[PDB]
Paper text:
The AAA-ATPase Drg1 is a key factor in eukaryotic ribosome biogenesis that initiates cytoplasmic maturation of the large ribosomal subunit. The initial event of cytosolic maturation is the release of the shuttling protein ribosomal-like protein 24 (Rlp24) by the essential hexameric type-II AAA-ATPase diazaborine resistance gene 1 (Drg1). The interaction with the unstructured Rlp24 C-terminal domain stimulates ATP hydrolysis in both AAA domains of Drg1, which drives the release reaction.
We assembled pre-60S particles, purified using tandem affinity purification (TAP)-tagged Bud20 as bait from a leptomycin B (LmB)-sensitive S. cerevisiae strain, with separately purified Drg1 in vitro and collected single-particle cryo-EM data. To capture Drg1 in the substrate-bound state, we used the slowly hydrolyzable ATP-analog ATPγS to prevent full extraction of Rlp24. In the Drg1–pre-60S complex map, the pre-ribosome is well-defined, but we see only blurry density for the major part of Drg1. This indicates that the Drg1 hexamer is actively engaged and undergoes its conformational cycle. However, the primary interface between the AAA-ATPase and the particle is well-resolved. It is formed by the maturation factor Arx1 and the eukaryote-specific 25S rRNA expansion segment ES27, which are recognized by the same Drg1 N domain. The same N domain that binds to Arx1 also interacts with the tip of ES27, which forms a single-stranded RNA loop exposing four nucleotide bases. The interactions with the pre-ribosome position Drg1 so that the Rlp24 C domain can be inserted into the central pore of the AAA-ATPase. Indeed, we found a continuous density of Rlp24 entering the central channel of Drg1. The Rlp24 C domain protruding from the pre-ribosome is contacted by the tips of four Drg1 N domains at the entry of the central pore.
Author numbering:
A (entry chain q): 2 to 106
B (entry chain v): 153 to 229, 239 to 406
C (entry chain T): 2 to 160
D (entry chain o): 6 to 59
RNA sequence: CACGGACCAAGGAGUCUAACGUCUAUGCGAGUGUUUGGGUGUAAAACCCAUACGCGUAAUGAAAGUGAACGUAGGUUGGGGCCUCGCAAGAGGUGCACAAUCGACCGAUCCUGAUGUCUUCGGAUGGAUUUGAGUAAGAGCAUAGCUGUUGGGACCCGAAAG
RNA sequence: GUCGAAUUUGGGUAUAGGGGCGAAAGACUAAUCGAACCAUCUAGUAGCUGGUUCCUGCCGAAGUUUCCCUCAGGAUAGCAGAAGCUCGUAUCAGUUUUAUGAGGUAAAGCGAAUGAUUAGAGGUUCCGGGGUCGAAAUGACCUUGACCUAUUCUCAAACUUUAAAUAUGUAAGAAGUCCUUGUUACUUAAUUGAACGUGGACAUUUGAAUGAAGAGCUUUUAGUGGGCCAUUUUUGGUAAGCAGAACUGGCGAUGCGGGAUGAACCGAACGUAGAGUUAAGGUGCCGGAAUACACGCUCAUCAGACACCACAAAAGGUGUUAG
RNA sequence: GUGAUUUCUGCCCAGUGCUCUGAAUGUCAAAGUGAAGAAAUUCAACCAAGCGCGGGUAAACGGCGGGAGUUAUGACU
RNA sequence: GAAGACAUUGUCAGGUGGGGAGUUUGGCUGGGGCGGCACAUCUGUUAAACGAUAACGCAGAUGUCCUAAGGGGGGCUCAUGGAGAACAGAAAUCUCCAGUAGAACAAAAGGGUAAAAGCCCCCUUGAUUUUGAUUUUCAGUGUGAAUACAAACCAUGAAAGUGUGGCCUAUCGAUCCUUUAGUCCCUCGGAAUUUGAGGCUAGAGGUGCCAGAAAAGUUACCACAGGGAUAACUGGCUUGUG
RNA sequence: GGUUGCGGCCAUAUCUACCAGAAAGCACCGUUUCCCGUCCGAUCAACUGUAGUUAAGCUGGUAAGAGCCUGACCGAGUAGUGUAGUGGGUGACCAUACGCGAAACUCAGGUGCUGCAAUCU
């Protein structure tokens, strides 16, 4: 698959509010996140006793992966996002969604 | 209420192949010497028999010839015996990924492993490295999982350059091939110099069919367990070998 | 399980009448709707955007808001044990104006004029309409013709 | 199992009432420009009447 | 031909509290509650009392904070009742609560930015089919009672188990 | 059955519960052993069986929606009381009518449109899932469809000019109409339109019928959440008191008169007494009531005699009667 | 594990089990060493037994077909 | 005497580990299981003219595919039949005539479409952003989808207008926790700065038993508190001539 | 009344064959520098009313043609169907009473009306 990365569409530049520079990315690998509250508490709960205690989706009914499609602006970066098609499988790259994907005829 | 023996075989594949293969096998074997009737369903076909000896002989022969798990049950109407049979949901050319436990159990083979022989012991070939692995139907039944790939994401390719390496078993294995998408042949600048097992069966400028890994709609879970750094991007399956004369 | 589609069980109704296929005539667009107008609902298969639910054939509503090439209709719905107010957005081509209000206004004007005329002439008049009563005594004279005789017909030779 | 039996009886046990059709429906569900015009018009009418009467 | 019932006498099963929801009664009232405590005593009673503290007299966000009037605290429609007219019929004047609706104001979110500035801080004004359990001459507190809910063994009797 | 041995037994001693013990049976371990007894937690737990103690008056259910690892169980909605609250004839109606809608269901559509079926006959890359495979691609595969090759007919729930009654919606007004002109940031080329306005004209015949035992509004909580039968129309099953669907009625909760008696059938729904008249049903006796009146039919050597219902085919009879 | 007492007691290391006087650079925890960060830390390498490969094992679990091949062929590949 | 800075000894860590400790084995269902998904869905019929309306009934399909098969505008008219035209073949190549749709409109089916919603063209990203209401399966909750308005921006077209994803009916997801993006948004509370963490509308990572536990057998050694057993009446079937 | 332009109603307005339409009006007509498109001025683009035009379209009549549309004391109270019975028949069903009410075929008539502006010895 492919998605456009840099485009001239609606954004929030605080100066234009027009079809101009746009950016977007893909999901990035989960950090070690030692200070993160989630695994911070999960580690102690697991290490207490009883081995595995927190429920785990052992079966393969769920196999989905993550993508991070965002309304990124190179001017500044903070809490934001962009909505696209449901992300069963998505990535980054493409440069206005080319990937040689044009339907030549 | 006069069946007295029911044999049922099921599989969850949208495109059944082993079903028709076993049907051709039994037709050529003329094993339906006592098959009283055959019922057709969209998800598979079932057999009816009146002789318990004939039914058990048929199920034993089917078990010997194709990996299947069998189970029996009784129905009181008076008494009838029913059989449920499950076959491996892996086809001949479906890419399959395995968890770390099975990987280290089967010779520490790479997760990116194909299949090339559907028989009593399910065979597995790694396109990345020439190596043969085998797995038990009972092992698969104890560890049920969905197949990694299917036949719904096949891509045609053209091979330009073939370079040998010197390691093979029976088919001039481990040959580098310069494979390009057939779709973009008019205007393209990207190609793949990938080493595959179709060395002695592929030439220059031939049409092949294979899988695709780079930006394919791939959404597995245990696939995340394998590092992306060791994930090949292009793997071939077969070729068209269109006849001319 | 019984599927409940948005347009299920409507194959016969979601069709244009015979010998009138193709695009719709332009009269349905020129008419004007305002607040208080009484309208009815009837869909058409040429226009697939903004058409109401299958529940709303032959249903009467009131116009309460108008937008560009779209109107709003308020209807009453019977659910459970109470009457609920429903608001629907209907395109122009699926709305039929009701002549009930038109003829009501016509007769209202007529009776207003007749009341004014009665007041002008100076004597009272009756307003309320009345369903027709049975016949009145009359005399049936037969001079150019005479009564004849009728009798039941036998079934013999015909059975 | 599944049946709509006695539904009419249940509905008509206590009677069914109209939605009361309150006059002056709320400006909810109409054009916001229309709402703004309505508010400005009523404000102007109030000003005019207040100036007129004393 | 489902269950229990030979007879008679005696015993016997919606109970009390912690927390409260609705309704009712009572006292006080923008305040309300004496009893943890002290003094007093006919002595487990009743009598008298301070500072605090609970509840409410303001909502809001994630908080740092802000904080509820352009007008006789608004307009539109009815409204019991009251007043004027007239013996009667009726009309007019005012119209609480109440019911719908349009506002106005305060908070959160998104826009726009003037004298100044310690040069990038300060955020007046004016907007936004948005959002709130809000204000718009406050009503709650305290006790008791019926009913009801949650944990208590919880209407009574009852195991195969640990 | 052996009885001089792997015999029996005394007394003492050892092994005490997830343990012991076992020439092995899941046997024994104080009458309890496929985990002993004892006491504590303990009033263990129950979506489960079993009970749940005074009277009368008033009102009066539901076995149906959504969801839940849910089908013997719970919350939401529905009914019912209570507490009431605001007004008290203003506002409405399980109804008809006037006018105005939509529907495609009965029936005969086939010379106004489409058309099978079960019965199996070939065709030269005018062609197809593939087989096991395959040092190749001038490489073998078995079978339906590839191909109707030259052809007949009917209707049907998946189709046809229209098209019924039952059933369903809206309107039948003063919260109106009309006249002049007031408002805006909406719109319009235009005080032109849209909405809401002040003043003025139209009150009992104010805009069909009839009815209204007062109308509207709020909080609330028990029970409820396994139905059956009857009438019509049916679905699958060969047919059925089988499995399952729509309206209304009834039993569930409901007695009373009648069908001798049947939860469901016909009348009729009930405070306590008197008098009268009747419903259905009956009038030889049991049994209250005309061995009434009148018309004609019937001889059975298993007659016959009240609907749902406790019986019935075709056909034969110089039996009889009327055509 | 069979169960005295005679003759024989065939074959097979695919797999699950068991074992090894073989090489290692695959899997690799703790601690330790290196780099960067001011640090909390991330990564790199080496990293034991076992797992893996190969060898042995069947009175250990277990198994002992069909076809071409010539109509039956203990000729027969 | 033998042995030695080796063992053993205490802690941590990896492996083996039914020898043992606790649990589990969905739901619908003409017994259960098997088979199936009637468990989320969609078209018709079942199904009796508002609507709603059962069955483990049938015909059946879904967990996709598309930067174009979307948006705008322009031009053209399809299947088939007939007539033909060196090589031309029953059909390849070109023209004319008839031709209301017998083709095509991604997928199953059914609606709708003829100077278009089809075939071919040129240009674009409206499959935009910020927050509501309404409608459908409904409790008037959400999930799923659609509606046309308002506030800015853009595309196409000369313009009126059209464009808020696929002509329409199905194509899919809460809490907790994780990963990177707007005003460089807020706090880390003795007072400061930087890493780091936790703070927010909407958006991925999923739960297919689809309003979402984390899950393999046997009991005839069984227990347990309960419900059902069972052939004597079909709507009168039942016996002699396919 | 004839047209022409622009429409509303959508076959009473469609197909096959003839017939007629005096300077008022419809279309051909010839041409390519300019704007424009394809293989070409075939359509489209533009250029002017002369030398010729009514053989077209269009406008109207007729066809003892097809079709369509309005009514029927046509087909019928027919088929159907709501309300009721302790109505009949062993049934499949049939009559009865209070209602409502069809349709294919046949016959009768016709082959458009209307809106604004401008032009016509």
């Amino acid at each position: 698959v492919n998605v456009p990365k840099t485009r001239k569409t609606y954004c929030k530049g605080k100066t234009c509010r027009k079809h101009t520079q746009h950016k977007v990315t893909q999901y990035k690998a989960g950090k070690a996140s030692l200070f993160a509250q989630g695994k911070r508490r999960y580690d102690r709960k697991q290490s207490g006793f009883g081995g595995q205690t927190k429920p785990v989706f052992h079966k393969k009914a769920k196999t989905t992966k993550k993508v991070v499609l965002r309304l990124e602006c190179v001017k500044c970066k903070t809490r934001a996002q962009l909505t696209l098609k449901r992300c069963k499988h998505f990535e980054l790259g493409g440069e206005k969604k080319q990937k040689g994907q044009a339907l030549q005829f | 209420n006069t069946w007295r023996a029911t044999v049922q075989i099921r599989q969850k594949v949208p495109h059944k192949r082993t079903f028709l293969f076993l049907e051709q096998l039994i037709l050529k074997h003329n094993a339906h010497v006592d098959t009283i009737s055959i019922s057709e369903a969209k998800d598979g076909l079932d057999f009816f028999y009146a002789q318990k000896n004939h039914a058990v002989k048929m199920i034993d022969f089917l078990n010997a010839v194709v990996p299947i798990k069998h189970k029996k049950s009784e129905e009181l109407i008076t008494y009838k015996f029913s059989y449920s049979v499950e076959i491996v949901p892996i086809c001949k050319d479906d890419l399959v990924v395995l968890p770390k436990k099975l990987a280290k159990s089967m010779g520490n083979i790479s997760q990116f492993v194909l299949c090339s022989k559907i028989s009593n012991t399910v065979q597995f070939m790694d396109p990345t490295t020439l190596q043969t692995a085998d797995l038990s139907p009972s092992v698969y039944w104890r560890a049920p999982f969905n197949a990694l790939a299917d036949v719904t994401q096949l891509v045609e390719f053209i091979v330009l350059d073939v370079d040998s390496t010197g390691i093979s078993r029976g088919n001039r294995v481990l040959a580098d091939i310069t494979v390009a998408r057939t779709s973009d042949l008019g205007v393209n600048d990207q190609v793949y110099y990938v080493r595959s097992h179709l060395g002695g069966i592929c030439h220059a400028g031939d049409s092949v069919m294979g899988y695709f890994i780079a930006n394919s709609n791939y959404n597995s879970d245990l696939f995340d367990g394998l590092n992306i750094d060791y994930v090949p991007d292009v793997v071939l399956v077969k070729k068209l070998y269109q006849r001319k004369s | 399980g019984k599927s409940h589609g948005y347009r299920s069980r409507t194959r016969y109704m979601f069709q244009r009448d015979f010998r009138k296929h193709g695009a719709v005539h332009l009269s349905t667009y020129l008419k004007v709707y305002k607040v208080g107008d009484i309208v009815d609902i009837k869909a058409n298969g040429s226009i697939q955007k903004g058409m109401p639910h299958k529940f709303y054939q032959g249903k009467t509503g009131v116009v309460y808001n108008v937008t560009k090439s779209s109107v709003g209709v308020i209807i009453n719905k019977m659910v459970g044990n109470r009457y609920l107010e429903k608001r629907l957005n209907l395109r122009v081509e699926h709305i039929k104006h009701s002549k009930c209000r038109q003829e009501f206004l016509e007769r209202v004007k007529a009776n207003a004029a007749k009341r004014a005329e009665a007041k002008a002439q100076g004597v009272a008049v009756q307003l309320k309409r009345q369903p027709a009563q049975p016949r009145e005594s009359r005399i049936v004279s037969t001079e150019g013709n005479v009564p004849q005789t009728l009798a039941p017909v036998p079934y013999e030779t015909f059975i | 199992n599944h049946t709509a039996h006695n539904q009419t009886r249940k509905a008509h046990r206590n009677g069914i009432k109209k939605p009361k059709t309150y006059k002056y429906p709320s400006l909810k569900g109409v054009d916001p420009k229309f709402r703004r015009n309505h508010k400005h018009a009523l404000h102007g009418t109030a000003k005019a009447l207040a100036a007129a009467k004393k």
